[PDB]
Amino acid sequence: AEEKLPFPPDIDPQVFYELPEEVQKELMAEWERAGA
């Protein structure tokens, strides 16, 4: 949560948190495997 995730480019947590967790959370796990 140290903003270690792929921020700030390609996405913003105001253009993808506009969802149910069920797909924001998969994004939050997809970035973990993305290299983050």
Partner: protein, 76 residues
């Protein structure tokens, strides 16, 4: 007629559709507007997380219904 698919950056793709197109046709028009692979597209409408074998009429989607996009990243 043309829906407003808001992408992961706040931009709004706008492309023509019909109640005889399908949820894979909207991804194919997005593949024209952005060149994004339908294999990573994850089109959504009010969070009713759309399918890939329906029609816009099947969801009472209108010509400016607005949608969202939340692509897959796969691994790299």
């Amino acid at each position: 007629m043309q829906i407003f698919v808001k992408t992961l950056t706040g931009k709004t793709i706008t492309l023509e559709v019909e109640p005889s197109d399908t949820i894979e046709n909207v991804k194919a028009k997005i593949q024209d507007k952005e060149g994004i692979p339908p294999d990573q597209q994850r089109l959504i409408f009010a969070g009713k997380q759309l399918e890939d074998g329906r029609t816009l009429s099947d969801y009472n989607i209108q010509k400016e219904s607005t949608l969202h996009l939340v692509l897959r990243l796969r691994g790299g």
